[PDB]
Design a protein around this ligand. Sequence first.
Ligand SMILES: *[C@@H](CC(=O)OCC)[C@H](C[C@@H]1CCNC1=O)NC(=O)[C@@H](CC(=O)[C@@H](NC(=O)c1cc(C)on1)C(C)C)Cc1ccc(F)cc1
Length: 179
Amino acid sequence: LDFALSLLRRNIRQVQTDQGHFTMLGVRDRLAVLPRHSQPGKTIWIEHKLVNVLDAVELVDEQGVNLELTLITLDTNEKFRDITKFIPENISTASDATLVINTEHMPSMFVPVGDVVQYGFLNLSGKPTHRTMMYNFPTKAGQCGGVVTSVGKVIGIHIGGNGRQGFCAGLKRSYFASE
Ligand SMILES: *[C@@H](CC(=O)OCC)[C@H](C[C@@H]1CCNC1=O)NC(=O)[C@@H](CC(=O)[C@@H](NC(=O)c1cc(C)on1)C(C)C)Cc1ccc(F)cc1
């Protein structure tokens, strides 16, 4: 859990958008990822600091279906420690995962969510979404953007839940490639 701690210190930041509080994962250089619904647009507050967003790309699959992830490029001289080696090449399930949440209201929280399983299609508030996974844990509002981690891997970003189960967008390394 010193890997989760390293991630927390170096790569996981408390942020806010017009849609409220979220956890943000910095991946490399000036590149970070958020849940799509956070809708950062042209700026974002990182630990209360107002920062320009140079580009926001909402990811879709080949079929043009929502993946519920937004890649943001930040206007800063700060580079995130490169964690691409910890992101699997294929969307991966895991046993006994930890959900890492870090927002102003929920700072530095490690939440064991149990096993993460393939789910796939998700009707997320009427928005057809692909490539999701599921955990049998009652995730709550304010936890979107939380980072799903396992044995030295970063496998998902929290995006939704029904009060009983939680769902993440799966991560694959190629999402973060340079060009
Ligand atoms: C995180 C963002 C936030 O807190 O929004 C506050 C309104 C949040 C986490 C969940 C809240 C409840 N438990 C969760 O872990 N995500 C959301 O609220 C999104 C929408 C939902 O999660 C819906 N749940 C489902 O649709 C659903 C379907 C199944 C089989 O299980 N759950 C709501 C009905 C609660 C926010 C969102 C994302 C994308 C969109 F297009 C619209 C809205």
